[PDB]
Symmetry: D2
Subunit: 251 residues, 4 copies
């Protein structure tokens, strides 16, 4: 399990500890052993008043700092997608594209060791990084990764409890998703542009799906250091829209 270090300026660093390893930093390098000794919740004092706080990274912190090729789903959105997909332990969820494994991790927590994340990724380098990212943080073998286009997947009809999409052209996978998804259950797509949203809404009218939700998730952060207290001057204003479709009654 990696560590997250924060310095006094609030800069964050993801460290994968190894014996003989050294964390380099402008106010003093620290052997990895010192980090492990301090442990999550602890500190390592260095030079000129500097102090590195040591943390077990939350899944949010991990997504935000992990290596990536494809930009991962933002934590606020991945969190909402799991709820909109109504995922509970033991469920089977279809995902494309794996990307960098950010959403994959959220999905994998939600369905747990008896559940399944069936994840597809078309690009081999993307998939390799995603697999590293997932495995470095999560040891439960409840993700089945597939190299290939979701359009071409061999899937059991009505075997999946939800379908999570994060890809540029979700209309292309709606036929496969409609086949996979249990009646009355949900597909939820993440899309940056309202034009993409409208295109998906129109495309879904050619499939057994009913539009249920189009929403924007906002996590409006405050800066509070009493007596200072105000919404942060600079916010992430937008990441993507979430589009939820419900699968038509069966047969």
């Amino acid at each position: 399990g990696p560590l997250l270090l924060k310095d006094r300026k609030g800069r964050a660093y993801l460290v994968f500890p190894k014996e003989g390893g050294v964390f380099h930093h402008h106010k003093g390098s620290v052997p990895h052993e010192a980090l492990l000794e301090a442990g999550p919740g602890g500190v390592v004092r260095t030079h000129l008043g500097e102090e590195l706080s040591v943390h077990r990274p939350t899944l949010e912190e991990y997504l935000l700092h992990m290596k990536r090729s494809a930009t991962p789903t933002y934590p606020k959105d991945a969190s909402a997608m799991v709820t909109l997909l109504d995922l509970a332990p033991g469920m089977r969820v279809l995902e494309a594209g794996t990307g960098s494994g950010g959403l994959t991790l959220f999905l994998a927590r939600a369905v747990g060791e008896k559940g399944l994340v069936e994840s597809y990724e078309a690009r081999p380098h993307h998939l390799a990084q995603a697999e590293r990212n997932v495995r470095a943080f999560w040891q439960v073998e409840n993700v089945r990764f597939h190299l290939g286009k979701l359009e071409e997947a061999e899937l059991e009809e009505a075997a999946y409890d939800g379908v999570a999409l994060d890809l540029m052209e979700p209309w292309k996978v709606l036929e496969k998703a409609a086949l996979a998804l249990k009646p009355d259950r949900f597909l939820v797509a993440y899309l940056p542009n309202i034009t993409q949203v409208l295109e998906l809404v129109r495309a879904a009218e050619a499939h057994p799906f009913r539009l249920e939700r189009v929403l924007e998730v906002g996590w409006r952060e405050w800066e509070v250091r009493l007596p200072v207290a105000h919404p942060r001057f600079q916010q992430v204003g937008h990441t993507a829209f979430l589009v939820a479709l419900r699968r038509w009654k069966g047969s």
Copy 2:
């Protein structure tokens, strides 16, 4: 388990099906047998002409429609709280107050059958309803309910992976929460008023927590039925602030 009925104007109704049972609304009645026979995503019509779609409710739907003692945590907030608490399967999470069991259900899904929700509620009538709400929707025996004030709980030290609070005066449970919480893990409190937030922040100065987050969750719904496409004219403007405090190692 429960069924959810949806009408044409979006409105939803929770039904607990029984033999010879009848769902009664202003727009007519439907026998419970008809609902059971309808299947997932099926439709029924009352004699008065009301068309109703039949569903197994999502957790979000259930929270919003289940019988309430205290108002439950809204789904957008319970969702964010689970993420801010960083709950993974097998974890042990402390909660107060159980209330109506809404947040309890989110916490219980997050930690799974190998984890534990340790949930406290001061008011017996509230706890009884919460236990009913939880058991009607969730069959996994991973919730341990406790009658009493969290301030008066007998808790194991550094035994909990998170502390979830939804109560009026969280400053009063800070000592107990700090005792229970493992180093580097979170207390996350749900608070409607910014004054409560500021009081919690000030009180937390006397306890082994760093303030990490104060945030507002918004789920801004759009209406899209082309040509129509805009954020909904009416939204939930505010429910509560979320405050995240991270326990340090002494």
Copy 3:
């Protein structure tokens, strides 16, 4: 001019005082003479026990309560539109459609007695009500009303300092607006649907405008009555998008 009455639950009522006139509400009646005698910020009580405060309405208050043909531009948006149009005293601004005269009033204040609002309205019943609404609140003769479609207006070239639009199909008036608007000045359109916004943007590709802004205005109200202090549970979620196009010099 008009008076505004406010009750205890925040609700407001516009009254036009006349000799022997009586304001009638569900919670009783007040003679118009009593309202006139009350003074600014004074209170009256109906026989039924309703307490009402007496005010000269603000423009914001007037817009929200005046008799309507078409729904007027909301105050938060009319306010932003005046700024995006960059209206200063003495300027000449083109408007369509007059509607109920809400935006007309904002525009007329901005340009002042030395400026001009040139306002077009296709529907005679709408224009008649708008003229009434404007004249009841504003005595400055700086508004020239015109019955007709803006697309069919006879306009002087490069004679206008801004073009304010609140109508369903602004793409249809782009040719006329481009003719009328001085170089470097703005057309600002109020549009409820994002689809309208995208259609306007696409249509504007064939006219001498650069797209400068597409924005949503929000005025997020708080309730503050200590201990209570939070954004209001219920807000206006959306009214319209504002689109600003800047005329270039050919």
Copy 4:
């Protein structure tokens, strides 16, 4: 009247043209005469595909680019304050502190040549810059500037149609503002911190004012370059709260 130049990268520059003046820029310097010749709405082509678009700056553009000491009120907020103050031509509005003259300009447009902005500023260097900023953009002599604390001002009772505040400790000027402001008219204060808001709300309970509004103005910008269309990824999340008080009935 100054010009605002924009280059192809979207960088904006405020230029006060003068004969013999030269605008310096990495892809080619341009004599001020060329700028004036192009005029608002025109362009000056320079090197390597660069093009400077020439503009008459809007008041919004001016506030955002003008020299400052004190940070001016943001345009979205100044716009809202004028509406909340219900300012119409001919009115008399009290202001403190002048700062850099941003809000002053909004107030001066609203009340017009027959109106009055009575503006107070305690700090001489601030006032000097504010006066330059106002005079460079606005030639109407409807602003009376005062060097000094508003607390110490000689004011006519019930002579002002509105009171606009942008200063750190508005509670200190409430006695003077209550004296100045006509019954049933408004004071509106701009405050960054919710703690300041609460302090003002409590302080106003010692004066003949009724709390009417506490609000946050948001102008949520979109990026639209078809087929791209989404709320901007990065927004100004917060500037300040606006607090509106209504003056009690007279006598």
